[PDB]
Amino acid sequence: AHTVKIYDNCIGCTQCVRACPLDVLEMVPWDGCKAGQMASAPRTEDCVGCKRCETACPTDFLSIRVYLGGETTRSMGLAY
Amino acid sequence: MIKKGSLVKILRPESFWYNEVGTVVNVETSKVLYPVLVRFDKVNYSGLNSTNFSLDELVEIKVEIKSDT
Amino acid sequence: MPSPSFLGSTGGWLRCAETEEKYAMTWSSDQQHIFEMPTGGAAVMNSGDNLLYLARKEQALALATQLRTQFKIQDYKIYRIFPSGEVQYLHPKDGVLPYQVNKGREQVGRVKSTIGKNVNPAQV
Amino acid sequence: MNLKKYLSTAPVVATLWLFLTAGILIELNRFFPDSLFY
Amino acid sequence: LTPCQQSEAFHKREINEVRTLENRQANYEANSPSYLALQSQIDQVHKRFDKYGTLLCGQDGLPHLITDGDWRHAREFTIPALLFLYITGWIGWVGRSYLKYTKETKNPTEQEIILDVPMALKYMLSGFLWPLSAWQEYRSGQLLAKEDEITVS
Ligand SMILES: CC1=C(/C=C/C(C)=C/C=C/C(C)=C\C=C\C=C(C)\C=C\C=C(C)\C=C\C2=C(C)CCCC2(C)C)C(C)(C)CCC1
Ligand code: SF4
Ligand code: SF4
């Protein structure tokens, strides 16, 4: 489906999973940040790509990118 | 190594903010790749004020010490 | 398991829901209450855990987000596959995703510049 | 005091100046024609 | 294309326009005061045609003019109706620019754009001789900018 790629601009303020609808991203301990959190998206098969994390993403250029890819039932958000 | 609060010039490999004048909020010794947050008066479209920046970025902007009367 | 009663049809007896994977949530519900479904009107919440059927994943997470704002209750959502495979996709760590956990890992993470360079040096 | 601050707002100043510019032109087309001399 | 004082096909339009206006003019009694102003209106009509005749005007009765720069017709373009627009518009523009120079300082920038002290608007009259002084200050604008622009990346 969609391709989630995390920039190196992360501050770890958990804005992803707070905004994110179906919890695509996930906070993971990391050793190269101020707060110490990093966003990671294992369940990219279930990602829909609604692009609501780029709104809550603080950085000048956003830190969580999701490039538009293929479309499946998991990424169309349809109930049928 | 420079002291905190210096007037900055953004030379980030990605953000070509060609010498947008701003000040250093604070200096951190935690040693990461994009640490420094600076007061960026040009409110980007995202709406925030201060974002993270590299160690490249700024070298100096006063350029003078004793000849600057 | 005792589940809230809802009238109005719409949600049930859909062929697509039967042939497609379905979601099953639950909540503690220590007290009798009354809530709203993300796709229905109003319904009374009974004591103990309550199992429902959901056809979308966003429908399965918005209800948990709405429950967390009411009272403080741990949420469990289980996501079933087409045949009969039942896997715990929600809270596989059992730790809340925004909060920090010990079980850490990285999936699909490129550590390059910000303007672009879409090539990934390593997938794992 | 504060009435002058409300008088100093963008819409009030704009309408006041535009009233001046419009009235000068209403009086211009009513009084002398442009002489225009080569 | 001949001038209209010699163009017989222009004076016929004056006669025809007054003829169309005359049918509306004669239906009402001229002695009434509310319609005595129509004679002053047709006086304005008459006093309008004579000035345009001096300008070269179309043989058809549609009065054309000149913008090539011909000194005989500088009145329709170059000198009056043109240069004053440039000066008056820029007397406003360079005055706004001077206000843009005094748009910073300590008091909030938003307060100094919108809720300005009326005194700056009263000072606007400063620009009697913009040209070269404005050129100096615009040089200084480009200079002190020091090529500080947006990324466009
Ligand atoms: C010649 C003449 C004259 C003069 C006049 C004048 C001087 C005028 C003016 C004026 C001014 C001084 C101004 C005006 C104006 C207007 C405006 C100003 C508007 C508008 C609008 C628009 C068109 C828009 C645009 C835009 C923007 C804003 C940005 C983005 C994009 C867009 C497009 C959206 C006189 C009468 C004396 C005489 C006769 C004739
Ligand atoms: S949106 Fe970016 S900066 Fe904010 S918590 Fe997520 S990874 Fe960190
Ligand atoms: S791509 Fe859409 S669904 Fe996935 S984390 Fe970003 S905002 Fe949430």
PDB file of C-alpha atoms in Angstrom, chain D:
ATOM      1  CA  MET D   1      -8.879  57.638  24.161  1.00  0.00           C
ATOM      2  CA  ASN D   2      -9.662  54.117  22.956  1.00  0.00           C
ATOM      3  CA  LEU D   3     -12.122  55.657  20.482  1.00  0.00           C
ATOM      4  CA  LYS D   4      -9.094  57.033  18.627  1.00  0.00           C
ATOM      5  CA  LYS D   5      -7.587  53.536  18.591  1.00  0.00           C
ATOM      6  CA  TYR D   6     -10.809  52.298  16.996  1.00  0.00           C
ATOM      7  CA  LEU D   7     -10.560  55.327  14.697  1.00  0.00           C
ATOM      8  CA  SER D   8      -7.012  54.180  13.843  1.00  0.00           C
ATOM      9  CA  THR D   9      -8.138  50.740  12.645  1.00  0.00           C
ATOM     10  CA  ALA D  10      -7.484  49.583   9.089  1.00  0.00           C
ATOM     11  CA  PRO D  11     -11.142  49.636   7.898  1.00  0.00           C
ATOM     12  CA  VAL D  12     -11.950  53.056   9.389  1.00  0.00           C
ATOM     13  CA  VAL D  13      -8.803  54.669   7.968  1.00  0.00           C
ATOM     14  CA  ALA D  14      -9.387  52.968   4.608  1.00  0.00           C
ATOM     15  CA  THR D  15     -13.004  54.125   4.317  1.00  0.00           C
ATOM     16  CA  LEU D  16     -12.075  57.646   5.440  1.00  0.00           C
ATOM     17  CA  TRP D  17      -9.311  58.018   2.852  1.00  0.00           C
ATOM     18  CA  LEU D  18     -11.432  56.428   0.116  1.00  0.00           C
ATOM     19  CA  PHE D  19     -14.237  58.869   0.946  1.00  0.00           C
ATOM     20  CA  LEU D  20     -11.748  61.704   0.420  1.00  0.00           C
ATOM     21  CA  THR D  21     -10.511  60.298  -2.895  1.00  0.00           C
ATOM     22  CA  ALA D  22     -14.042  59.662  -4.175  1.00  0.00           C
ATOM     23  CA  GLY D  23     -15.434  63.046  -3.139  1.00  0.00           C
ATOM     24  CA  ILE D  24     -12.569  64.939  -4.776  1.00  0.00           C
ATOM     25  CA  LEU D  25     -13.374  63.181  -8.054  1.00  0.00           C
ATOM     26  CA  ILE D  26     -17.126  63.763  -7.738  1.00  0.00           C
ATOM     27  CA  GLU D  27     -16.365  67.468  -7.319  1.00  0.00           C
ATOM     28  CA  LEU D  28     -13.853  67.400 -10.187  1.00  0.00           C
ATOM     29  CA  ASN D  29     -16.312  66.080 -12.782  1.00  0.00           C
ATOM     30  CA  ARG D  30     -18.849  68.641 -11.496  1.00  0.00           C
ATOM     31  CA  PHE D  31     -16.690  71.793 -11.599  1.00  0.00           C
ATOM     32  CA  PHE D  32     -14.257  72.870 -14.364  1.00  0.00           C
ATOM     33  CA  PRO D  33     -13.487  70.633 -17.338  1.00  0.00           C
ATOM     34  CA  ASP D  34      -9.849  69.764 -17.859  1.00  0.00           C
ATOM     35  CA  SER D  35      -8.453  72.738 -19.757  1.00  0.00           C
ATOM     36  CA  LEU D  36      -5.503  70.816 -21.283  1.00  0.00           C
ATOM     37  CA  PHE D  37      -3.151  73.168 -23.177  1.00  0.00           C
ATOM     38  CA  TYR D  38      -0.739  72.006 -25.896  1.00  0.00           C
TER      39      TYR D  38
END
